[PDB]
Ligand binder design. Structure first.
Ligand SMILES: [K+]
Ligand SMILES: [K+]
Ligand SMILES: [K+]
Ligand SMILES: [K+]
Ligand SMILES: [K+]
Ligand SMILES: [K+]
Ligand SMILES: [K+]
Ligand SMILES: [K+]
Ligand SMILES: [K+]
Ligand SMILES: [K+]
Ligand SMILES: [K+]
Ligand SMILES: [Mg+2]
Ligand SMILES: [Mg+2]
Ligand SMILES: [Mg+2]
Ligand SMILES: [Mg+2]
Ligand SMILES: [Mg+2]
Ligand SMILES: [Mg+2]
Ligand SMILES: [Mg+2]
Ligand SMILES: [Mg+2]
Ligand SMILES: [Mg+2]
Ligand SMILES: [Mg+2]
Ligand SMILES: [Mg+2]
Ligand SMILES: [Mg+2]
Ligand SMILES: [Mg+2]
Ligand SMILES: [Mg+2]
Ligand SMILES: [Mg+2]
Ligand SMILES: [Mg+2]
Ligand SMILES: [Mg+2]
Ligand SMILES: [Mg+2]
Ligand SMILES: [Mg+2]
Ligand SMILES: [Mg+2]
Ligand SMILES: [Mg+2]
Ligand SMILES: [Mg+2]
Ligand SMILES: [Mg+2]
Ligand SMILES: [Mg+2]
Ligand SMILES: [Mg+2]
Ligand SMILES: [Mg+2]
Ligand SMILES: [Mg+2]
Ligand SMILES: [Mg+2]
Ligand SMILES: [Mg+2]
Ligand SMILES: [Mg+2]
Lengths: 154, 200, 129, 114, 79
RNA sequence: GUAAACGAUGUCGACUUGGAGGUUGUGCGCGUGGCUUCCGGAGCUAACGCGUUAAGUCGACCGCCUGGGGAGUA
RNA sequence: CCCGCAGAAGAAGCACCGGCUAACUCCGUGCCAGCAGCCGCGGUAAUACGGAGGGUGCAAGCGUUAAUCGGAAUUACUGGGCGUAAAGCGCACGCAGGCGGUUUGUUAAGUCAGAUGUGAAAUCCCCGGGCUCAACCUGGGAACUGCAUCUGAUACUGGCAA
RNA sequence: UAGCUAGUAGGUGGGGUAACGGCUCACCUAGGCGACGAUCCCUAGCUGGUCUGAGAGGAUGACCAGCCACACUGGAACUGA
């Protein structure tokens, strides 16, 4: 599995004494072949937070039906305030996406894609929107299956 | 319009052999290829996503001695041309004639080969000339008494000579037979990073 | 008031599928039947039937595959407040070809693929996937 | 907004007058205090421009030579901690001298090469 | 054919002249909605055949007055 | 001629699991209408919450918004 | 344009290095002097000021200012909102306007199809050609999304009739 | 900025122009324009294109080419295809 650290953030809660700082780590993991998951870890230290995130990511992986390291069709993904658009691209396009979407698409095994993040670009929600977009993407076979047709008829 | 500075620092900053030296002795004996240049050299911080994309672009540039304006124009050409942009870009850089004088073995370095600067029997003194398929590249007669070209060929004869070209002895000529595929070139350049950097 | 019976049909299907209804019924019309025929032939609905004479009612049998509803999306395109017509070359692809656009052409209601093969444009009734 | 509504009804340097620089005459030269949280004596000047606008301009770098009736070239650029100071004086243009004894960013302070 | 327009008579008060409204139905350039637009032409009507509300065919002719360069061809429908 | 004139929620129509009440008709304990209150499901929502009286799923038309102030002022 | 002569000879700068943003140290200063696109930096160990050493980026240029579009889905046609963030008129009636249940016939305005005419050349784009290359110049094409006219189609929308 | 218009809108006849025409004049009719924004005010040469933009747009009209307008300011004709 390829692993990527998207974001580390210092968060704080107040107590009687003062402030207690801690760290959050957002990570994605993927096999580079249409399997991808994200993880979010919290700890008092940065490396502990990353380790927790990576462990979470490995167990929460979903399957994406790719085509030649690009998408099957244009997809929209939404989570919270994040709305993402992703489109299939030709070979040699590369990942034309912002960093959070790029990390997801790279480990998933999407080599060629045109993307755009609308609304909030908060990494935590962009990653959820992106994976939401990918996981509800249909291949021609499942479309043919559900409609009760052959793939050439589709 | 030329980088006329210390050459080993480039390979050091890139952290890889860019084939920028003659090869009278080893790269390890010449410089610390492990270490980046300068006072804060043994340090190596995390490099950003931007910083990675930059260093890949600066790698592919600094080998050939192509400055940014001219490199940008190659990207535009590669994007314009049909098919894979990253592959088109490397094909355009490989198609350059000033690679050929060095690559055929007339200069010890590209900097020397550039000081030394015929195609299809016509004189061409332009480093940026795109050599086509089936074109014969060759040397003159008037400067075959230079010891530089003698030494440079002996340096060239220890390298692996290129595998879509046909360098010859004496009259000193070779055909650009076909353009190289990506398979021909080093699986080390991540040219998608350059495509992405200019798409930014 | 009721000013778009076709949008109403599409909504009855959309809401029926979301509620796991076996069938949905509605007031019939010639245009609704024409659309129902396209949905059946493309395998989005299982069957339809019209019952009555003075007040005919159209019943659509909805279809589910692996629990999930087969009509994953269905959207009105041309609408009374904004009619949408396309020439043959500008006919829309729904879901990169995996879905359908229903098109009213001078040779009747048909899919975008059938319109494109017939060399016809027309009014874009709806997108289905 | 509905289509029918749209059919019915569809969807910082003013004294330069869209010029890159303007010439002016210093009508007052003074110091002013920055807003919080800063503390300094910031060198400004009121300037009557050739187009008749009167504006406060900032004098940058270490030490200046401007009086009343000094003729200066201003450019755009606010000074964040002086409210209502929207222009900078160009050092080493016209009367306004180059900054004495500068060695880095010399071209920004009108200082010829040592 | 020869070129003609069709429209509704909106005034017949002038001597030997009528005002004809041509209604056209055009797609809005930006917003895509189809909109009614009207062009009023002053038309020659030698005999004063037409009345307010009649549908008339008209054709373009030479200028006959300051505002008239169209003539009546037929009445399609009387009001 | 204005109010925190408030459900701070425009009007009309269609569609989409339930539960407990109030009030007012009506047919044979069991139905069937109108109006209304509380809880909650999917769904929706930044969240709070809304939830067949929607802030859900749609259509028609209108009104209105476009950083805080300056100012609902000149 | 070519040939010959002499000798590295006559020819490198500009911005930047706190984050955003590629590049870090020492010395001077001590909320001063000053910096600053935004957040901010400076009150005695300042990678943020000033100099130096080192480094990064561009390079016969480099920076700064001005100006336009972009990013800005931040006027949202494509492509946004209005319970509490800005936003539902206090409520209604209603003319203009927008919209319009269902069936048949008819019409062919919208719509759709084809054809014809036009849409200057240049420019853009594609495949070539010419200047040593490039810029530049240039052959043919494509494009000019439009407009008009004629001939058809009639599902949908409109008109008319029942 | 909500009303504007008396050669004003149309007609007949005479005159005038290279030519149609309120172009002009006499008489007759009382029209004509306007919320699909007339009239009034402010700004502006228009286009091919140009810059930007994934596109739809947005901005723009310097150079090159097409059209227009002007020639110290206001007015006028003469000559002449
Ligand atoms: K301070
Ligand atoms: K919560
Ligand atoms: K309203
Ligand atoms: K303001
Ligand atoms: K919209
Ligand atoms: K019809
Ligand atoms: K007149
Ligand atoms: K007359
Ligand atoms: K334009
Ligand atoms: K004049
Ligand atoms: K003459
Ligand atoms: Mg969780
Ligand atoms: Mg936002
Ligand atoms: Mg140059
Ligand atoms: Mg009020
Ligand atoms: Mg009250
Ligand atoms: Mg109350
Ligand atoms: Mg209110
Ligand atoms: Mg009541
Ligand atoms: Mg509730
Ligand atoms: Mg008031
Ligand atoms: Mg850095
Ligand atoms: Mg110190
Ligand atoms: Mg700017
Ligand atoms: Mg925009
Ligand atoms: Mg908004
Ligand atoms: Mg409030
Ligand atoms: Mg509010
Ligand atoms: Mg109200
Ligand atoms: Mg009402
Ligand atoms: Mg109807
Ligand atoms: Mg027609
Ligand atoms: Mg042309
Ligand atoms: Mg009809
Ligand atoms: Mg006459
Ligand atoms: Mg006239
Ligand atoms: Mg002017
Ligand atoms: Mg855009
Ligand atoms: Mg001009
Ligand atoms: Mg314009
Ligand atoms: Mg004459």
């Amino acid at each position: 599995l390829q692993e990527k650290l998207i974001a580390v953030n210092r968060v704080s809660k107040t107590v009687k004494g003062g402030r207690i700082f801690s760290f959050t780590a957002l990570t994605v993991v993927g096999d580079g072949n249409g399997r991808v998951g994200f993880g979010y870890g919290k700890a008092r230290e940065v490396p502990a937070a990353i380790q927790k995130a990576m462990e979470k990511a490995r167990r929460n992986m979903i399957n994406v039906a790719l085509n030649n390291g690009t998408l099957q069709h244009p997809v929209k993904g939404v989570h919270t305030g994040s709305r993402v658009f992703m489109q299939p691209a030709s070979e040699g396009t590369g990942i034309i996406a912002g960093g959070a979407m790029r990390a997801v698409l790279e480990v998933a095994g999407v080599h060629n894609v045109l993307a755009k993040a609308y609304g909030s670009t908060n990494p935590i929600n962009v990653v959820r929107a992106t994976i939401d977009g990918l996981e509800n993407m249909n291949s021609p076979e499942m479309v043919a299956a559900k409609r009760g047709k052959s793939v050439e008829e589709i | 319009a030329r980088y006329l500075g210390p050459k080993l620092k480039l390979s050091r900053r890139e952290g890889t052999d860019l084939f920028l030296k003659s090869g009278v002795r080893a790269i390890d004996t010449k410089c610390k290829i492990e270490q980046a240049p300068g006072q804060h050299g043994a340090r190596k911080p995390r490099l950003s996503d931007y910083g990675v994309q930059l260093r890949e672009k600066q790698k592919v540039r600094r080998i050939y001695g192509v400055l940014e304006r001219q490199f940008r124009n190659y990207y535009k050409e590669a994007a314009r041309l049909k098919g894979n942009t990253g592959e088109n870009l490397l094909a355009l850089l490989e198609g350059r004639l000033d690679n050929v004088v060095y690559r055929m073995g007339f200069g010890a370095t590209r900097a020397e080969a550039r000081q030394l600067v015929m195609v299809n029997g016509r004189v061409v003194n332009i480093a940026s000339y795109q050599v086509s398929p089936n074109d014969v590249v060759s040397i003159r007669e008037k400067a075959k008494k230079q010891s530089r070209v003698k030494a440079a060929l002996e340096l060239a004869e220890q390298r692996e000579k290129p595998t879509w070209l046909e360098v010859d002895a004496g009259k000193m000529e070779g055909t650009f037979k076909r353009k190289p595929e990506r398979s021909d070139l080093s699986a080390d350049i991540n040219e998608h990073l350059i495509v992405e950097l200019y798409s930014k | 008031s009721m000013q778009d019976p076709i949008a109403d049909m599409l909504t009855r299907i959309r809401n029926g599928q979301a509620a796991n209804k076996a069938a949905v019924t509605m007031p019939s019309s010639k245009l609704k039947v024409a659309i129902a025929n396209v949905l059946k032939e493309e395998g989005f609905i299982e069957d339809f039937k019209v019952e009555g004479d003075t007040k005919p009612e159209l019943e659509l049998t909805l279809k589910y595959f692996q629990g999930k509803a087969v009509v994953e999306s269905i959207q009105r395109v041309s609408r009374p407040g904004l009619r949408i017509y396309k020439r043959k070359d500008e006919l829309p692809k729904v879901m990169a070809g995996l879905g359908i656009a229903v098109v009213s052409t001078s040779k009747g209601v048909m899919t975008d693929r059938a319109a494109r093969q017939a060399g016809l444009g027309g009014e874009i009734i709806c997108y289905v996937a | 907004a509905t289509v029918n509504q749209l059919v019915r009804k569809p969807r910082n340097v003013p004294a330069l007058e869209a010029c890159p620089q303007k010439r002016g005459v210093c009508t007052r030269v003074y110091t002013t205090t920055p807003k919080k949280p800063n503390s300094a004596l910031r060198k400004v000047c009121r300037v009557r421009l050739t187009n008749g606008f009167e504006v406060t301009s900032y004098i940058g770098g270490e030490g200046h030579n401007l009086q009343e009736h000094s003729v200066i070239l201003i450019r755009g650029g606010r000074v964040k901690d002086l409210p209502g100071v929207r222009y900078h004086t160009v050092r080493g243009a016209l009367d306004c001298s180059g900054v004495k004894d500068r060695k880095q960013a010399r071209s920004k302070y009108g200082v010829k090469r040592p | 054919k020869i070129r003609t327009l069709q429209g509704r008579v909106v005034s017949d008060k002038m001597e030997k002249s009528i005002v004809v409204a041509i209604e056209r139905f055009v797609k809005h350039p930006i917003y895509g909605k189809f909109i009614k637009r009207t062009t009023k032409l002053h038309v020659h009507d030698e005999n004063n055949e037409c009345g307010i509300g009649d549908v008339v065919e008209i054709r373009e002719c030479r200028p006959l007055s300051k505002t008239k360069s169209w003539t009546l061809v037929r009445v399609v429908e009387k009001a």
